[PDB]
Design an enzyme around this catalytic site. Structure first.
Site, PDB file in Angstrom:
ATOM      1  N   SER A  81      -6.133  -3.903  -1.857  1.00 41.72           N
ATOM      2  CA  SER A  81      -7.158  -3.862  -0.829  1.00 41.72           C
ATOM      3  C   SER A  81      -6.785  -4.717   0.374  1.00 41.72           C
ATOM      4  O   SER A  81      -6.512  -5.905   0.240  1.00 41.72           O
ATOM      5  CB  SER A  81      -8.488  -4.344  -1.395  1.00 41.72           C
ATOM      6  OG  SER A  81      -9.434  -4.555  -0.362  1.00 41.72           O
ATOM      7  N   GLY A  82      -6.759  -4.108   1.552  1.00 42.43           N
ATOM      8  CA  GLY A  82      -6.467  -4.851   2.762  1.00 42.43           C
ATOM      9  C   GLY A  82      -7.514  -5.939   2.965  1.00 42.43           C
ATOM     10  O   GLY A  82      -7.180  -7.071   3.305  1.00 42.43           O
ATOM     11  N   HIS A  83      -8.779  -5.607   2.708  1.00 45.75           N
ATOM     12  CA  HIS A  83      -9.887  -6.556   2.854  1.00 45.75           C
ATOM     13  C   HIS A  83      -9.637  -7.766   1.970  1.00 45.75           C
ATOM     14  O   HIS A  83      -9.785  -8.906   2.405  1.00 45.75           O
ATOM     15  CB  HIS A  83     -11.209  -5.918   2.413  1.00 45.75           C
ATOM     16  CG  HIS A  83     -12.054  -5.400   3.535  1.00 45.75           C
ATOM     17  ND1 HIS A  83     -11.744  -4.258   4.245  1.00 45.75           N
ATOM     18  CD2 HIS A  83     -13.219  -5.860   4.054  1.00 45.75           C
ATOM     19  CE1 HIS A  83     -12.678  -4.037   5.152  1.00 45.75           C
ATOM     20  NE2 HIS A  83     -13.583  -4.996   5.058  1.00 45.75           N
TER      21      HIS A  83
ATOM     22  N   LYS B  44       0.836  -1.197   0.000  1.00 49.88           N
ATOM     23  CA  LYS B  44       0.000   0.000   0.000  1.00 49.88           C
ATOM     24  C   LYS B  44       0.868   1.244   0.000  1.00 49.88           C
ATOM     25  O   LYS B  44       0.745   2.105  -0.868  1.00 49.88           O
ATOM     26  CB  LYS B  44      -0.916   0.050   1.232  1.00 49.88           C
ATOM     27  CG  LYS B  44      -2.234  -0.704   1.104  1.00 49.88           C
ATOM     28  CD  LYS B  44      -3.114  -0.439   2.321  1.00 49.88           C
ATOM     29  CE  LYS B  44      -4.443  -1.170   2.233  1.00 49.88           C
ATOM     30  NZ  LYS B  44      -5.207  -0.787   1.026  1.00 49.88           N
TER      31      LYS B  44
ATOM     32  N   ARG C 297     -15.667  -3.997  -1.616  1.00 54.65           N
ATOM     33  CA  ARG C 297     -14.969  -2.713  -1.603  1.00 54.65           C
ATOM     34  C   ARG C 297     -15.166  -1.932  -2.903  1.00 54.65           C
ATOM     35  O   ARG C 297     -14.981  -0.717  -2.932  1.00 54.65           O
ATOM     36  CB  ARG C 297     -13.481  -2.917  -1.310  1.00 54.65           C
ATOM     37  CG  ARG C 297     -13.213  -3.819  -0.122  1.00 54.65           C
ATOM     38  CD  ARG C 297     -13.926  -3.333   1.113  1.00 54.65           C
ATOM     39  NE  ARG C 297     -13.189  -2.270   1.780  1.00 54.65           N
ATOM     40  CZ  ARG C 297     -13.631  -1.602   2.841  1.00 54.65           C
ATOM     41  NH1 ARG C 297     -14.820  -1.874   3.361  1.00 54.65           N
ATOM     42  NH2 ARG C 297     -12.866  -0.681   3.408  1.00 54.65           N
TER      43      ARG C 297
HETATM   44  O1  VO4 Z   1      -7.715  -1.530   2.106  1.00 52.17           O
HETATM   45  V1  VO4 Z   1      -9.334  -1.636   2.064  1.00 52.17           V
HETATM   46  O2  VO4 Z   1      -9.248  -2.372   3.676  1.00 52.17           O
HETATM   47  O3  VO4 Z   1     -10.201  -0.462   2.680  1.00 52.17           O
HETATM   48  O4  VO4 Z   1     -10.055  -2.965   1.515  1.00 52.17           O
END
Ligand code: VO4
EC number: 1.11.1.10
Length: 574
Positions: A399-401, A350, A487
């Site tokens: 995406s962390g999710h 990220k 997301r």
């Molecule tokens: O990085 V995201 O956790 O908002 O999917």
């Protein structure tokens, strides 16, 4: 102090008769409480770390006393390196008390007041009330523990020793530090969220009604590159996102991505929003974006895994069964460690790319016929508060999710293959679950009309109640998929933040441009047909790498599992 009235959890109360699940549950409660009071270990990457540390400590406490056959403990008692040397039972044989000591010690070390100077700088932001509320949770859990807690037993003390080891070894005190970081503006570059450019926080956390001050938050910009990994045996990398570095020439992909972003993730009432009511539900279902009484994604993933664990247990007795105790202790260690490392690597990438969020990308596009300077997203839900939707304070790719989900659910798939059914490790499974309810849509939590009141239960507070939706999923493959695309529906992540657009969307004759239905909504591939095969290049490294969070998570889970949950060699640590 006035204890916060926590809403009821939608789960069979029988689950907590098992002491492994009970302690997992205690971890989840601290997760949601800390996010309500603004205590320590908040945010997605660190909250996952807390759970990984908890289950690693439990894992070794239990398996030291009740030795496993097909695998061994994470740390060994014969390690010459004192930092990785596991204590010995030396008589202790009460696994229940061992687990209790490990869990209680770890959680207390994690959530209690840092009397040992650590309060300065690191903890200098958490109020006394926060710690007090967290303490209540800890105190009563002792009293609710199945079988009770005998702090004087040798086994209890052994567990504590186990916890001390893991704590000293893996704790990252300054993990979420942002000191020295500042965004570098430009196209494709992450910067302050347009709808939340600055926030006013009290100068003194112990006086929230006192003077405030402007604050700009950047969530854990150094964590991923400096932190100690748990069980990964290598560094993981993702292809360059469309528009950057070696993929700066992928303009058709980026342009179509902007197009899909507007149609699928815009505010409910915008004429450009083509997302369906059901898709809106799918988006909110997986949120858990650090809200009051809810916590972060790791909490939800664990809630789901708890159901899978009980649904597929070998023995019916939850309370008195070593077969179940061993199964759960092993499963949760695997799952939560994978989740921890998924957080490290998603955060590392990220802040490596610092790719901007769809909100900024669409607004600042600059091209009259491509952008929308006044666009608004469905956004991350500000549940149990009266604030408006936002975009979590960190870069978009990946995406962390998506990464969390990829790791957690791939780990579950590897663990149950041949037991629940049979499948190739890269193809859809059959681990189905029913009656799965998300706290984002449970008929209790809501969007308040006034500030949240922590002295009153959520039900006695005016607001629009979230519709109760009871879900059933056919496989962990589906869970993994929906968790990722949610997301996109919220408009907080690009399609490529989840996975390669080619792997999840229906293609057209035009390359990099995907199919839309009669009303313009994007069409996804059927879950059973999805394969994360599309890889891309990196400017700084040779070879092909995965695109998006899901593939990254899958990769991390396979590695940890294939090595049987072995510590990251200290040589490859940062
Ligand atoms: O990085 V995201 O956790 O908002 O999917």
């Amino acid at each position: 102090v006035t204890p916060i009235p926590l809403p009821k959890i939608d789960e069979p109360e029988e689950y907590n008769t098992n002491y492994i699940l009970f302690w997992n549950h205690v971890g989840l409660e601290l997760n949601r409480v800390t996010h309500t009071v603004g205590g320590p270990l908040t945010g997605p990457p660190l909250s996952a770390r807390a759970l990984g540390m908890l289950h690693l400590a439990i894992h070794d406490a239990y398996f030291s006393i009740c030795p496993p056959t097909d695998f061994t403990t994470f740390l060994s008692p014969d390690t010459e390196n004192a930092a990785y040397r596991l204590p010995s039972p030396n008589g202790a044989n009460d696994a229940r008390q061992a687990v209790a000591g490990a869990a209680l010690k770890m959680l207390s070390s994690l959530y209690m007041k840092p009397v040992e100077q650590p309060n300065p700088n690191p903890g200098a932001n958490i109020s006394d009330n926060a710690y007090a509320q967290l303490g209540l949770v800890l105190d009563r859990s002792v009293l609710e523990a199945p079988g009770g807690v005998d702090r004087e037993s040798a086994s209890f003390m052994f567990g504590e020793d186990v916890a001390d080891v893991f704590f000293a070894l893996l704790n990252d005190p300054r993990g979420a530090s942002q000191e020295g970081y500042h965004p570098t503006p430009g196209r494709y570059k992450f910067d302050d969220e347009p709808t939340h450019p600055v926030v006013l926080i009290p100068v003194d956390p112990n006086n929230p009604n006192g003077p405030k001050m402007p604050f700009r938050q950047y969530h854990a910009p150094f964590y991923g590159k400096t932190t100690k990994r748990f069980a990964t045996q290598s560094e993981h990398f993702l292809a360059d996102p469309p528009g950057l570095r070696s993929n700066a020439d992928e303009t058709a992909e980026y342009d179509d991505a902007v197009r899909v972003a507007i149609a699928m993730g815009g505010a409910q009432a915008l004429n450009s929003t083509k997302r369906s009511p059901w898709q809106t539900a799918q988006g909110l279902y997986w949120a858990y974006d650090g809200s009051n009484l809810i916590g972060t994604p790791p909490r939800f993933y664990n809630q789901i895994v708890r159901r899978i664990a009980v649904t597929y247990k070998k023995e019916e007795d939850l309370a008195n069964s070593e077969v179940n105790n061993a199964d759960f202790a092993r499963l949760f260690a695997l799952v939560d460690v994978a989740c921890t490392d998924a957080g490290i690597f998603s955060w590392k990438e990220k802040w490596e790319f610092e790719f901007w969020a769809p909100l900024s990308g669409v607004r600042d596009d600059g091209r009259p016929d491509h952008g929308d300077p006044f666009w608004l997203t469905l956004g991350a839900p500000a549940t149990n508060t009266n604030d408006i939707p936002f975009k979590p304070p960190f870069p978009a790719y990946p995406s962390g999710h998506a990464t969390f989900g990829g790791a957690v659910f791939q780990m579950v798939r590897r663990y149950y293959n041949g037991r629940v059914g049979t499948w190739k490790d890269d193809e859809p499974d059959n681990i189905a679950i029913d009656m799965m309810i998300s706290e984002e849509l449970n008929g209790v939590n809501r969007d308040l009309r006034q500030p949240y009141d922590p002295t009153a239960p959520i039900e006695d507070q005016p607001g629009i109640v979230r519709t109760r939706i009871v879900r059933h999923f056919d496989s962990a493959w589906e869970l993994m998929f929906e968790n990722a695309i949610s997301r996109i529906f919220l408009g907080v992540h690009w399609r490529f933040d989840a996975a390669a657009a080619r792997d999840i969307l229906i293609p057209t004759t035009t390359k990099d441009v995907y199919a839309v239905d009669n009303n313009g909504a994007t069409v996804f591939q059927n879950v059973e047909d999805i394969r994360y095969t599309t890889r891309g290049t990196r400017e700084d490294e040779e070879g092909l790498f995965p695109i998006g969070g899901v593939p990254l998570g899958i990769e991390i889970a396979d590695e940890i599992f294939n090595n049987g949950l072995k510590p990251t060699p200290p040589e490859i640590q940062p």
